[PDB]
């Protein structure tokens, strides 16, 4: 029978008041015999009726993908409200209920430090600019880079790792042409996280 996967909103969407966070209830392995799926949504046990079903999508492995999306309020998500999606289908003996919410616990502010490339890397064509983010809870976070008010795309960021004190840390590595570093150009690490003032901080790095 059908399977249900309930996804949280994107951290950026929850943390930016100019974005719209949404939770997604995905049903897969919906048969061609009974494509009819009923959704019931609940916010802290209270049913809501403003969800929207996405266009049904054929998967060509004998199944449909059926998706319901619910807009959530920024503060509701951040205050830890629970979102429950109840899925009913003729092929299911009983309804499937899934639940998501933000991870429980007192939020902790990320400490953000930028580290310059090592002297030993200065022989290479390109250098590594490091954004070290530690002491944050929960693990919902976005990290990006910029220079001269323009986004820098040549970076990779590690998954968050649970630290021994119960917070998380991660590193982001921006790779730049060595000359750009040598020429005194200022680079900046942007971090979005709920426990930051205005969900945001920016830390800068240039050759000193």
């Amino acid at each position: 029978g059908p399977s249900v996967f309930l996804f949280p909103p994107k951290p950026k969407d929850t943390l930016m008041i100019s974005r719209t966070p949404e939770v997604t209830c995905v049903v897969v392995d919906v048969s061609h015999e009974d494509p009819e799926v009923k959704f019931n949504w609940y916010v802290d046990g209270v049913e809501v009726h403003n969800a929207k079903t996405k266009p049904r999508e054929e998967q060509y492995n004998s199944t449909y993908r059926v998706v319901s999306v619910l807009t959530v309020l920024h503060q509701d998500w951040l205050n830890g409200k629970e979102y429950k999606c109840k899925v009913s289908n003729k092929a299911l003996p009983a309804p499937i209920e899934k639940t998501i919410s933000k991870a429980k616990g007192q939020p902790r502010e990320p400490q953000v430090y930028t580290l310059p490339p090592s002297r030993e890397e200065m022989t290479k064509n390109q250098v590594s600019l490091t954004c070290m983010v530690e002491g944050f809870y929960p693990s919902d976070i976005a990290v990006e880079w910029e220079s001269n008010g323009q986004p820098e795309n040549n970076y990779k960021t590690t998954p968050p790792v649970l630290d021994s004190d119960g917070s998380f840390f991660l590193y982001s590595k921006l790779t730049v042409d060595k000359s750009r570093w040598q020429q005194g150009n200022v680079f900046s690490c942007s971090v979005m996280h709920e426990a930051l003032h205005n969900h945001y901080t920016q830390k800068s790095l240039s050759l000193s």
Binding site: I17, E144, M192, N198, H199
Partner: peptide, 13 residues
């Protein structure tokens, strides 16, 4: 006050 990110409003207190 307000935080901005590449000309996009993040949050204000």
């Amino acid at each position: 006050d307000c935080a901005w990110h590449l000309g996009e409003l993040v949050w204000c207190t």
